[PDB]
Coordinates of C-alpha atoms in Angstrom, one line a residue:
X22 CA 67.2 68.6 84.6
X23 CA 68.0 64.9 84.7
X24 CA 70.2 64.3 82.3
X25 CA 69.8 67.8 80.4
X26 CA 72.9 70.2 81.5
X27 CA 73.5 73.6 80.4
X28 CA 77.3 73.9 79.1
X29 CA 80.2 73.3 81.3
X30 CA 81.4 77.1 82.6
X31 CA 85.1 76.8 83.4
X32 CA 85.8 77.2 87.1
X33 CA 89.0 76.1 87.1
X34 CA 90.8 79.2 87.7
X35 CA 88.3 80.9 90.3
X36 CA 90.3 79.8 93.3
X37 CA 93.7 81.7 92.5
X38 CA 91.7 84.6 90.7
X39 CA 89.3 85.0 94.2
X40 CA 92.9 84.7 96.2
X41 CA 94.2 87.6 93.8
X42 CA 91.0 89.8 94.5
X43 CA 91.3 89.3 98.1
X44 CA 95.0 90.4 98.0
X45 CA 94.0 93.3 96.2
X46 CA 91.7 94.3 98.8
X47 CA 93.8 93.1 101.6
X48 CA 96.8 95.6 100.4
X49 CA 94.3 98.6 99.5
X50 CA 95.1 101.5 101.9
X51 CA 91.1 102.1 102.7
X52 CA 91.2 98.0 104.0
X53 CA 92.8 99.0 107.5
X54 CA 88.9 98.2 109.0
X55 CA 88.4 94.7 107.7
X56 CA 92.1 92.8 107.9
X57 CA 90.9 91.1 111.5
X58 CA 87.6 90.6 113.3
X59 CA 86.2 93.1 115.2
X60 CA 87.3 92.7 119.1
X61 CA 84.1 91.5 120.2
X62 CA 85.3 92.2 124.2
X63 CA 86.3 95.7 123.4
X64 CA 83.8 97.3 121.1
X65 CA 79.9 97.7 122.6
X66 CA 77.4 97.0 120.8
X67 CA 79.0 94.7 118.1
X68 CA 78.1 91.3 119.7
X69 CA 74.8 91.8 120.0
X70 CA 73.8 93.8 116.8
X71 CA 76.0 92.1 114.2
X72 CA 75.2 88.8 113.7
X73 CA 77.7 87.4 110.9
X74 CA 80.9 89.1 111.7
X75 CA 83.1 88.7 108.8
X76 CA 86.4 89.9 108.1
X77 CA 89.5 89.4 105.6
X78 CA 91.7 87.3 107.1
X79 CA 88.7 85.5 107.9
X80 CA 87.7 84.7 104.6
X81 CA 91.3 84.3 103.1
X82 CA 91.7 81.2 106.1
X83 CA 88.2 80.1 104.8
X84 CA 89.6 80.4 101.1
X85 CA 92.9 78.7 101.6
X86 CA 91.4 75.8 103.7
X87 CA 88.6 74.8 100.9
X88 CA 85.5 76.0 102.9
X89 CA 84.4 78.2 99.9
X90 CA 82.4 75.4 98.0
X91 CA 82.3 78.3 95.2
X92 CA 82.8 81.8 93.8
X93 CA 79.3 82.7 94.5
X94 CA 79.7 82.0 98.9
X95 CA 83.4 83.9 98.6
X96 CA 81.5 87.1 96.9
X97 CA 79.1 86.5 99.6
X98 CA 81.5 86.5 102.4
X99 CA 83.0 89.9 100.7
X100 CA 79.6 91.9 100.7
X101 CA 79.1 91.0 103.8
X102 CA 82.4 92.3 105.4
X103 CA 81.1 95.5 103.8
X104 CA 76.8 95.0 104.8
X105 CA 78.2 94.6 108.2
X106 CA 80.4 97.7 108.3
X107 CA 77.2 100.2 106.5
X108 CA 74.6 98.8 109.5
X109 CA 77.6 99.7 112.3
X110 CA 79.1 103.1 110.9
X111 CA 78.1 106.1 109.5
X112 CA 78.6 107.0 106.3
X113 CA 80.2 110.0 107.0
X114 CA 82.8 108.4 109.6
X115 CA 86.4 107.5 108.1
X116 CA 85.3 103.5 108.7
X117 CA 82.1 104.1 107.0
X118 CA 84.0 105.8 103.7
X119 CA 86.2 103.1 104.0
X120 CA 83.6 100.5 103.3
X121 CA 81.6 102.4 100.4
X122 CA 85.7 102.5 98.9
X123 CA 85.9 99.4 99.4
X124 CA 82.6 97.6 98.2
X125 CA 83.4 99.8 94.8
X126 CA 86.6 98.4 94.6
X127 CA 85.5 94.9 95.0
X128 CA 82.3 95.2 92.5
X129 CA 84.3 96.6 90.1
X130 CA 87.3 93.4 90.1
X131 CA 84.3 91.1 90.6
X132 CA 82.7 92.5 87.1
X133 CA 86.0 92.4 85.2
X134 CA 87.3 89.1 86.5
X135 CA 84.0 87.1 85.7
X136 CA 81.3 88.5 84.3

């Protein structure tokens, strides 16, 4: 409260450690779903049923232009790339696989890189 503040976590590093993740997952062989936005002319249905598109090279222009105000909306971003892709696919498609890969993947850098 006013005055009262828990201990100063240091956040310095979370910008190049985020960038680091997202290279990891960018370079994954599984990631071939997610590098660019859906083609919102050429795939029915998308547009109207998927609300937040997101994407990788989406969030790595969002994360090298300072419009992640901190590693809580970048994680955000991230599960939604894969939220996105489970309400879309099957699970038993290969894009569908791809995402549960994925989302593993991520959780599991997330967990050993700050918590």
């Amino acid at each position: 409260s006013m005055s009262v503040k828990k201990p100063k976590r240091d956040d310095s590093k979370d910008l190049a450690l985020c960038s680091m993740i997202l290279t990891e997952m960018e370079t994954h062989e599984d990631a071939w779903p997610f590098l660019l936005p859906v083609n919102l002319k050429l795939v029915p249905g998308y547009k109207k049923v998927i609300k937040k598109p997101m994407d990788f090279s989406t969030i790595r222009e969002k994360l090298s232009s300072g419009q992640y105000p901190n590693l809580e909306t970048f994680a955000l971003d991230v599960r939604l790339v894969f939220d996105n892709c489970e309400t879309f696919n099957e699970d038993d498609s290969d894009i569908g696989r791809a995402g549960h890969n994925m989302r593993k993947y991520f959780e599991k850098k997330w967990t050993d890189t700050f918590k």
